[PDB]
Amino acid sequence: KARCSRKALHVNFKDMGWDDWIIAPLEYEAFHCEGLCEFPLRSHLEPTNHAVIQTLMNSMDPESTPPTCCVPTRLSPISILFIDSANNVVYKQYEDMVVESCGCR
């Protein structure tokens, strides 16, 4: 079981039933964040003070305090061409579509 890390996550819009409104792209690489969050956190990644304290408490007693969680801490956009609710054709940059870094929070 690895420490918190960015990992593959392929998104297929047709698989998700979004081919009836998304024209392009039909797939993209989104990534996801998963893995152990335990003392020591990767300190060069600047975890929040809260997460440092919570990780210390979870190391003190993992039966009393739960661990922090591996999540996206930076994300980036992709552009999508799609048909909106009103049948306009739209090319739009969707924010926060792709994980760029993971971290324990």
């Binding site: 020591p40 300190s43 304290i53």
Partner: protein, 50 residues
Amino acid sequence: GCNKALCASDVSKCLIQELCQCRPCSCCKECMLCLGALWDECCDCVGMCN
């Protein structure tokens, strides 16, 4: 290595004071001051052993 039992509290102290959060190395020496007698035993928990 990094003894979690020996190091977790003192390393956490240094982290929340915003020390030991660089990499090889500017902040190297204020991190060492903060870990104090535990530098040898714990420098690996923050990757500063040089």
